[PDB]
Symmetry: C3
Subunit: 512 residues, 3 copies
């Protein structure tokens, strides 16, 4: 009588409504354990047997409820598709830091495991999610977050832990538009795969086989506010064609080669603390902390250091030989500011390629260098415009050195100093000159006049050479004339006597 289907509804409660609706109100979503056999449910709650409990999940999904509650039991699923906008609610008590053996997990919280040699555990659809779930696939195959359809899928994981997966991403060649707010990526082959438009708050990347966090082309956009990278058995941060990326705060600890790899993707590192790197590397050309190539990289507060293992360990020597490894065609950009990038052993750069634009300011380990704009800096010494070198015979056509400047406004004037350096290629003698140049603009155009010229033994002078009245001490004649109407670009003309023919390699630098 009371043991039948309608038995529960026949017993009232103190509130005024019977037991059945009292139980119905307490649940937030449909419980998976409801669709389970007694022995199978007991095994799930006891963490003992595999039991391949995929039918419970299939029936829970077929119920049609957008909310699925997975209690702390241990599950084993096989190729069960998750319908759209379906979320899995789970509670965890302990998320293991390092899962070295199958017995790493204890009771802890909810665990969903792949069964036997299944090719997948879940086939995700758009707008799916999960909380408190520790996904685990025993084999390093079966990539996690694998969509049923080979297209971009937007999901989200608030607190979850992915273990022993090939990659947290679909089909090895497609992207997922997700943001792992607080997750733990451990013992995988790829810590994060091809996330697009992702905002990852506090993830943790532990020792992963292979690369770790790897992004490919198109996986444009991505922010990693406070992620931490542990001893990844591989490349750690790896970006190839990601248009954007920014790792904000947390450190990048020991990695087994190229703690950061940047190939064609613009990136920015705000406060990344790039610790030791390249534990397993070939020393020269492969022990650098950052492998920079053909891309734009910006750094604002990056710190670095060298060292060995924390304690014990097979390798104790300071691992990273260099800091930068540059290769490929030289067309990238590099901006550096306020970064204490002195962490290396033998050198700073391991290639003959350099970014087309360099902006390094206030960073120990690298003197200030700027290659663009009117005001540039070379080796810590500033100058204006360009430093042109003109080598050739300074007879019958005075050598021309094209200088640049900020410019002069109308009815305005400017003054500046030029360092002129002469290196006679034949004899080997050296000479120097300091001159002061004033640029003035009237209503029509601008003109340049040499205020003063000074040198050792009065070798250079504004007076014309090849003249009987010329001072015999003077060997070089220097003059200046403006090319552009804005006086921004002019040129210095240097000539010698008609009789002598020699190459001197004139160099003119405009000092502010």
């Amino acid at each position: 009588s009371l043991a039948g289907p309608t038995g529960a509804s026949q017993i009232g409660t103190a509130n005024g409504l019977n037991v059945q609706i009292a139980l119905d109100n307490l649940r937030s979503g449909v419980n998976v354990l409801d669709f389970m056999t007694f022995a199978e449910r007991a095994a799930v709650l006891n963490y003992t047997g595999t039991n391949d409990n995929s039918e419970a999940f299939r029936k829970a999904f077929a119920t049609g409820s957008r909310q699925i509650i997975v209690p702390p039991g241990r599950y084993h699923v096989k190729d069960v598709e998750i319908p759209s906008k379906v979320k899995l609610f789970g509670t965890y008590s302990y998320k293991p830091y390092n899962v070295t053996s199958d017995a790493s997990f204890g009771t802890d919280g909810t665990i969903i495991r792949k069964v036997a040699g299944a090719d997948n555990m879940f086939l995700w659809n758009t707008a799916c999610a999960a909380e408190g779930v520790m996904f685990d696939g025993r084999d390093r195959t079966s990539p996690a977050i694998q969509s049923k359809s080979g297209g971009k899928i937007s999901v989200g994981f608030f607190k979850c832990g992915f273990y022993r997966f090939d990659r947290v991403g679909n089909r090895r060649g497609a992207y997922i538009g997700c943001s792992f707010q607080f997750c733990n990526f451990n013992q995988n082959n790829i810590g994060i795969y091809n996330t697009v438009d992702g905002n990852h708050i506090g993830c943790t990347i532990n020792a992963n086989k292979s690369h770790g966090v790897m992004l490919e082309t198109g996986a444009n956009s991505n922010t990693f506010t406070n992620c931490r990278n542990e001893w990844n058995e591989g490349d750690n941060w790896n970006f190839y064609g990601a248009t954007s990326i920014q790792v904000i705060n947390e450190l990048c600890d020991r990695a087994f080669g190229y703690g950061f790899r940047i190939s064609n993707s613009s990136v920015t590192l705000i406060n990344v603390n790039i610790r030791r790197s390249a534990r397993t590397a070939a020393s020269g050309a492969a022990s650098a902390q950052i492998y920079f190539e053909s891309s734009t990289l910006k750094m604002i507060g990056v710190n670095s250091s060298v060292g060995g293992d924390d304690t014990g360990g097979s390798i104790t020597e300071p691992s990273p030989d260099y800091f930068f490894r540059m290769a490929g065609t030289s067309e990238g950009r590099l901006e550096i500011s306020d970064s204490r990038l002195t962490g290396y052993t033998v050198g700073l750069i391991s290639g003959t390629a350099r970014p087309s634009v360099i902006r390094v300011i206030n960073s120990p380990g690298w003197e200030d260098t700027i290659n663009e704009g009117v005001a540039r800096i070379s080796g810590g010494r500033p100058y204006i415009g360009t430093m042109p070198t003109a080598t050739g015979p300074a007879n019958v056509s005075p050598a021309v050195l094209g200088l640049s400047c900020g410019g002069v406004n109308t009815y305005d004037n400017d003054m500046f100093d030029i360092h002129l350096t002469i290196r006679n290629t034949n004899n080997g003698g050296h000479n120097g000159a300091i001159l002061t140049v004033l640029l003035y603009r009237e209503g029509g155009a601008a003109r340049a006049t040499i205020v003063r010229v000074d040198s050792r033994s009065n070798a250079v002078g504004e007076g014309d050479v090849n003249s009987t009245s010329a001072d015999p001490q003077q060997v070089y004649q220097v003059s200046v004339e403006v090319t552009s109407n804005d006086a921004s670009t002019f040129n210095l003309l240097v000539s010698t006597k008609s009789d002598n023919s020699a190459s001197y390699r004139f160099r003119a630098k405009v000092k502010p």
Copy 2:
């Protein structure tokens, strides 16, 4: 017998306590669905009918429990006041990104909706809160988080979603002391309203009608660590009298005019990526990315770019013409560092007003400029002190140019170089001079001596003019004397012959 009020307590359990207390322990707070009719509760759980279920909420509040549990059903409330320190616990499965139609919401999680043409849905009090709730008011009226009493109210929303509201704030003229840690502000008329002492962790501002995140006077203080602003149909970030504000990391995407507006509020942007802006604007004077006025603005890592819509779209041309639009009285402050603010089309500034203090360093698109301190920079060229221009007739009273310096200590000396520029206003001729000045202090006071003077044709000289022994080549007499006892401020006196009277516009610049 068992169907009465005391029926539940008469059936024991395996643990040792009967069913009634077993049910009482499982619940964390009082369930709202308990105070509902069968048909009304079924409609709530089925997302079908309006049913105007305000009495359930009123009775739940009148119960006196500080915790209110709202299951995933759909509700419709009307002007129900929430007592103090009362929190609404809800679970959501999917929070819509863009709610374009009434059928945007599906099953998803808990939804609380305004009913018919009610002027409000909730009247909040101090220390209220909510989790997992997607508040929705069909009409764009009825501002959310509207306090019953017209005063400041401190609330908090961990994970909630506000849709189609006039503003998330009370009475259109009062403030709320809240911090939206992880929220979604979509299709409102104002994304965030007058939050005071707020620390917003990871909010999301989607396409909102009107301004979006707008703060007014008094709403002093506010931090937006990782918020993201989508295509707001209006002003996007808008601050008027907020004393403080700092947007830390996330980007500011396309907005329909003045992606940032700053009127009288000091602000700071740490790593904001200000994307395209001013989709709907009047081009000149209204297409700038930031409308800066009469305030203090600081930037540390700001990035910018131009572009059109992602795909399709009515407008495809690069939207923002400029980067800065400055108007109003010029008394503000502007500090810029390490910001790649090259994102514009035609210009950089759209006004004749400039901040009183400018500190721009290492930012592409703007040469270094500093207006305060001893060491200043103009157009990338540094100098010390001030660059004074003195125009007038240099006869019978030598023209005086007041120069500044860091100072000289007791029994100490300093040397520096001065560039002197002369522009004869009548004839139009131009002349220049370089001189070296040494400042020395003895026990009593300091004095200045001119080490050297050099010019073209020896026009200037330290020798006295109007003397028969004077070199005829010399036309100008230059001298230096100290005014302050600290030698920090001195002046350069330039004089001409007694016979000639002309204005030259002398300019003296102290080059380090």
Copy 3:
């Protein structure tokens, strides 16, 4: 019949499974209230009596479930050890901002209190955790998170509130490897104690008796992304031997002395807004905002200001007299960039000790200073190498001033300017010289030649003194020769006549 142990299982439900398993599936963990007497449980749910309910917790722990559910009732425990990997799940409705009296807590959420004069409430083990729990110990004794064994313990608290504790840490001398993601530390004696490898997301430190957040030696590592420090009755931030530490974003408000204290620990402050400090201090030498000693401190976006209490208050005058207080042996490092550190009243530094390395750039209130590298800055004026002072009699052994430079490559040349300053110690006269030096390297070695020398009255000259052909105006002979083979280091030799003997204090500065 139905009231016995097996009564619940005899009533079926609509789903197909009886009431007993229906109740068993709804619970996530073992409920503590299950192991309680009727009157004791009623008192717990009514927040009325102490009742010393430790046996319920002991039996719940002895059950063996890794998950413990604490409902919103008020508890009183005494020295109950928490087994490993055990988490306490609680729900809170209101976390008090300031607990001034015992009646500060109302109904609110789950509260666990220490009973009578117990020496502890919980004895934690490895991998323990808690959520939503407001721990409170009435006496300021009984440190929270006190491990049973005196060793490092790794725990974690997502959302918890610690009130009136001696310190959140074990045994006053040991460390805990935890990360308080979102916590509230109020009215304690120490806000945070000896956290190791901690990543604290959004903590809140309210008015705490004593220091507040204090770290000691070994508590190396720690990140405080968005913590906020309120009016701590003590030292606020206090680090002694912590190897690392970085406070990222949130402000540091009024503190009762040394808002930051750094003794031997390297630290970095990214965007800390250090407000007023030292409300209770001895003015001179104790009213500084930061007490810096013998350590490395870096700052990137730090802001500061002065002021009094918000309203009312006993003290209304601007509190912090200075900004820095430096003491102890001078061997530390200091890096400053883009920090508006103008917040003080009387001065900036309160000690005669300075860091060995200083790098201050683009920070108002302090002129640019750099002490390392080839390019240095003093008081906003740049130079290359070192500024040596050589005092002594310049007769029979010319005085030598060792200058440094970046260096010259093979078959390369460089030019630069040297400022030479002479202060005759006997008479008191002062003199200055400007000279231009060219360094050139041939195949073998490098050599230096003086391009030009200029001074007032031609006092200095490259010609040899003590020669009958020497110009009588020349008093000093200057020469330059290179010491290193790289021409990076050379020296300037200055000599006088043989007859005169006097000390001049020569100073040579290499201006870029």
